[PDB]
């Protein structure tokens, strides 16, 4: 009787990936995530 509801969501990352899961609020605007690693920079 007192919960966060839930529904199928389609999350849009910031580089490409689009994980299609559930939770709360159908549209999610993510910055980064997996498919974003190990993005190194070399080292002197």
């Amino acid at each position: 009787g007192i919960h966060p509801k839930l529904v199928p969501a389609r999350i849009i990352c910031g580089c490409g990936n689009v994980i299609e899961t559930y939770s709360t609020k159908p549209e999610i605007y993510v910055e980064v995530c997996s498919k974003c690693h190990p993005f190194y920079t070399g080292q002197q």
């Binding site: 920079t41 070399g42 080292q43 002197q44």
Partner: protein
């Protein structure tokens, strides 16, 4: 507040990029505080000066569009 270049000294990379060609240590004294922060040099320790002594200021991946000075306070009691 440049537009064409990055004022960062040369007596630094002629030291930072040689040390670059290998992956060595980090004790790197220097007075060139007046200089941008070299991309990649993130992971290296620069002994910035402040009229007093060199400074074990490391270097992160988030301090590039910032001259070495921004991390080497001058006056005491801040």
């Amino acid at each position: 507040s440049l537009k064409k270049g990055v004022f960062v000294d040369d007596h630094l990379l002629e030291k930072v990029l040689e040390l670059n060609a290998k992956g060595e240590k980090r004790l790197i004294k220097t007075w060139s505080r007046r200089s941008t922060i070299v991309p990649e040099m993130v992971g290296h320790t620069i002994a910035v000066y402040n009229g007093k002594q060199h400074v074990p200021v490391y270097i992160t991946e988030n301090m590039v569009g910032h001259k070495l000075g921004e991390f080497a306070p001058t006056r005491t009691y801040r």
